[PDB]
Amino acid sequence: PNMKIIGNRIERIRSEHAETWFFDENHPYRTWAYHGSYEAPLINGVVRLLSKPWDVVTGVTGITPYGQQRVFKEKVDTRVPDPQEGTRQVMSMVSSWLWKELGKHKRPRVCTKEEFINKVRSTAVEAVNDPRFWALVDKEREHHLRGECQSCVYNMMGKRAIWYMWLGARFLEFEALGFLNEDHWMGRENSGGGVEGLGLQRLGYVLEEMSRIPGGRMYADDTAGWDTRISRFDLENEALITNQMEKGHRALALAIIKYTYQNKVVKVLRPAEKGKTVMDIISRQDQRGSGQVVTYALNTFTNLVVQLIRNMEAEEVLEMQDLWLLRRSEKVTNWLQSNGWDRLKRMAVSGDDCVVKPIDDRFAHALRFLNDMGKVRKDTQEWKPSTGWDNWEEVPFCSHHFNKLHLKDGRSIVVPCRHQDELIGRARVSPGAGWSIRETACLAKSYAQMWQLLYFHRRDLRLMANAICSSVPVDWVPTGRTTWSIHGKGEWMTTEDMLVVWNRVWIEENDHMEDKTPVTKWTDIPYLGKREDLWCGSLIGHRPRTTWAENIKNTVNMVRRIIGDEEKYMDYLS
């Protein structure tokens, strides 16, 4: 461990728990440095009541110190092996080229306290309105400008692993690197292959556009445990963005990168004897600390780099000898300057997910650089060629597939779809304990309106959404977080009529809809074919679902009585 960079944080934690601090020789950490330990100490009722048939669907009901330790042994206690020197030379060249393209029409900048407060306002609200929080933030920034870090420490939670950091550390990351998100550096117009800021209502059109580019099949390979495969070399290559920063901003960003990305200090819970719990203090110099302000943007960047490299190997620009040491590097510069933009426009990359439309199917067996970079494909033998898709409507991307549907008048739209159990299961989860009827119903309304905008083509979701919206007062504003996906843009977070929002999103503002004729009734908005709806998890035709549909108005009346019969309600079912 680099005690010169993490030592201050470990010593600070040790001094805060000095009387219970101890070194456990029987700790379970294999690839993380261990420093010591100390002693340490959910249903949305509205959605549940309106989704009775799914109480026995394991796909729905399925989705702590023991939990944190399980994710360590199953996923995070691993070390990605170093790529060879030539592979590292290619990764650095491609990353340098890509940063220069992304920065051609954009300038890095510091993000402000005002920008952060505005994003928070959408107990974090209490902290941003307290001057003592900003004083703690200022003390840590002063340490950073002096080459020190005292409190940027992760808190592991898990259940993929989720790494939490105190709001002030997240502010310092946002100040230095938030411009990647706020100024849309990974937007498609700026990056060619990125899709940041496109909603699920548009991603399908990107895949359809890619299908028309001449080339091989569409490949959408997943890397097994992407965040654990981000190496110290990937982090150094991502850090090249600091070369485009002015000196003051550069100092802030280098502190975030060096002290919190390239060196990390984490707190993890672990069960101990007699039902007691300990907190372990560990560290490491690689992996992506999933949950950072710029995890998505940096994962998108590095996945773009990986896919450009796999295309160069497929096109026989890179040879086997180049893994050991890159020979004739001008060939890589030429390929990037000549073909890089064309190959970026042949990709759709969102964090660790990608779809590539290579110039031919040599991409399927171009595995040497991919495997040497440790970006090993999930659910496939390491050296077996990839299998691509001939039909863009079957390609998985961002946990969805995309289907062309036809409106009653002959026009077509391209909609997002996924297996329905995950959609209902997520809506049935309420975040945090102590949620009242007002907060629970507003969050149920947000899921229901999101379904009306994006998944209206699924029979069960259109009906369940109409039942939820009929059970929650119409003047209640949808609240909470409907998804963690950057592609759920929140047009459904409104009291504007969802048929109006549907028309704005799918017709008026949809650049892929040439005819702007409005759709004036929900009965003119299509469903998937019954067999497609069933393939993706519908319960149509299943007796408990038929009973639920026939009883739905009774169920809505029951919920209205619970919330209060005096509220303003709208009948969305008739």
Ligand SMILES: [Zn+2]
């Ligand atoms: Zn710090």
Ligand SMILES: [Zn+2]
């Ligand atoms: Zn589907």
